[PDB]
Design an enzyme around this catalytic site. Structure first.
Site, PDB file in Angstrom:
ATOM      1  N   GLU A   1     -12.373   5.599  -4.620  1.00 58.61           N
ATOM      2  CA  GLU A   1     -12.697   3.894  -4.986  1.00 58.61           C
ATOM      3  C   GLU A   1     -13.101   3.537  -6.358  1.00 58.61           C
ATOM      4  OE1 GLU A   1     -14.078   4.073  -0.207  1.00 58.61           O
ATOM      5  OE2 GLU A   1     -15.513   3.564  -1.825  1.00 58.61           O
TER       6      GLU A   1
ATOM      7  N   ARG B   1       0.949  -1.286   0.082  1.00 58.59           N
ATOM      8  CA  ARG B   1       0.066   0.063   0.068  1.00 58.59           C
ATOM      9  C   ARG B   1       0.879   1.416  -0.113  1.00 58.59           C
ATOM     10  NH1 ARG B   1      -2.691   4.333   0.145  1.00 58.59           N
ATOM     11  NH2 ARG B   1      -4.767   4.542   1.438  1.00 58.59           N
TER      12      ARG B   1
ATOM     13  N   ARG C   1      -0.258  -5.623   4.685  1.00 59.25           N
ATOM     14  CA  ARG C   1       0.227  -4.944   3.476  1.00 59.25           C
ATOM     15  C   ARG C   1       1.567  -4.299   3.836  1.00 59.25           C
ATOM     16  NH1 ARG C   1      -5.016  -1.317   1.642  1.00 59.25           N
ATOM     17  NH2 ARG C   1      -4.364  -0.476   3.584  1.00 59.25           N
TER      18      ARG C   1
HETATM   19  C1  LIG Z   1      -1.847   4.203   3.994  1.00 60.46           C
HETATM   20  C2  LIG Z   1      -2.159   3.408   5.550  1.00 60.46           C
HETATM   21  C3  LIG Z   1      -3.169   2.809   5.574  1.00 60.46           C
HETATM   22  N1  LIG Z   1      -3.453   1.972   6.739  1.00 60.46           N
HETATM   23  C4  LIG Z   1      -4.726   1.583   7.156  1.00 60.46           C
HETATM   24  C5  LIG Z   1      -5.525   2.624   7.761  1.00 60.46           C
HETATM   25  C6  LIG Z   1      -6.809   2.327   7.235  1.00 60.46           C
HETATM   26  O1  LIG Z   1      -7.638   1.353   8.063  1.00 60.46           O
HETATM   27  P1  LIG Z   1      -9.198   1.086   7.884  1.00 60.46           P
HETATM   28  O2  LIG Z   1      -9.272   0.018   6.975  1.00 60.46           O
HETATM   29  O3  LIG Z   1      -9.689   0.695   9.543  1.00 60.46           O
HETATM   30  O4  LIG Z   1      -9.839   2.442   7.611  1.00 60.46           O
HETATM   31  C7  LIG Z   1      -6.647   1.430   5.924  1.00 60.46           C
HETATM   32  C8  LIG Z   1      -6.798   2.491   4.881  1.00 60.46           C
HETATM   33  O5  LIG Z   1      -6.461   1.592   3.644  1.00 60.46           O
HETATM   34  P2  LIG Z   1      -7.202   1.977   2.266  1.00 60.46           P
HETATM   35  O6  LIG Z   1      -7.172   3.258   1.770  1.00 60.46           O
HETATM   36  O7  LIG Z   1      -6.281   1.279   1.260  1.00 60.46           O
HETATM   37  O8  LIG Z   1      -8.648   1.244   2.405  1.00 60.46           O
HETATM   38  O9  LIG Z   1      -5.219   1.235   5.890  1.00 60.46           O
HETATM   39  C9  LIG Z   1      -2.492   2.299   8.069  1.00 60.46           C
HETATM   40  O10 LIG Z   1      -2.744   1.773   8.961  1.00 60.46           O
HETATM   41  N2  LIG Z   1      -1.181   2.797   7.611  1.00 60.46           N
HETATM   42  C10 LIG Z   1      -0.880   3.611   6.432  1.00 60.46           C
HETATM   43  O11 LIG Z   1      -0.100   4.149   6.394  1.00 60.46           O
END
Ligand SMILES: Cc1cn([C@H]2C[C@H](OP(=O)(O)O)[C@@H](COP(=O)(O)O)O2)c(=O)[nH]c1=O
Length: 129
Positions: free
Chosen positions: A37, A29, A75
């Site tokens: 989305e 990610r 991820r």
């Molecule tokens: C980019 C990033 C996302 N995330 C987590 C937070 C969000 O949790 P929640 O799923 O609980 O909202 C999710 C968002 O990713 P996506 O934008 O891919 O959905 O990924 C991290 O924890 N660290 C990060 O640096």
């Protein structure tokens, strides 16, 4: 921070890509970005942008920040480079991502991305249109 090698396994969408890193498959990610989305305006264009960038690259590199390297979903969290160009920054500069998810320790390139976002927004590009 330091760049490390990786090879593309599969494009996934605007801000996730499956890479072989240290010889293991991982979904990465992109740090410091949020995209529409896949069924929201510009979601598909973000996926196509990142796909072309990573698929056309001769060399993909992964650059972890100082803080956590995997998220709660397993991820990898990284800056991804395609022939030396940062995918995270390029997506933002194109107005296909917003700077987002800025957690203190994993924000080395925040101001670089915020500068790109300001330029996209001045240009009224894509999500800013
Ligand atoms: C980019 C990033 C996302 N995330 C987590 C937070 C969000 O949790 P929640 O799923 O609980 O909202 C999710 C968002 O990713 P996506 O934008 O891919 O959905 O990924 C991290 O924890 N660290 C990060 O640096």
């Amino acid at each position: 921070l330091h760049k490390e090698p990786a090879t593309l396994i599969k494009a996934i969408d605007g801000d996730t890509v499956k890479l072989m890193y240290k010889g293991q498959p991982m979904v990465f990610r992109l740090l410091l970005v949020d995209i529409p989305e896949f069924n929201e305006k510009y979601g598909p264009e973000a996926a196509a942008f990142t796909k072309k960038m990573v698929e056309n690259a001769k060399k993909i590199e992964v650059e972890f920040d100082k803080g956590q390297r995997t998220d709660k979903y397993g991820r990898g969290l990284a800056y991804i480079y395609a022939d030396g160009k940062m995918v995270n920054e390029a997506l933002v500069r194109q107005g296909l991502a917003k700077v987002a998810y800025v957690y203190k320790g994993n924000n080395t390139h925040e101001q670089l991305l915020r500068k790109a976002e300001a330029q996209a927004k001045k240009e009224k590009l894509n999500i800013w249109s």
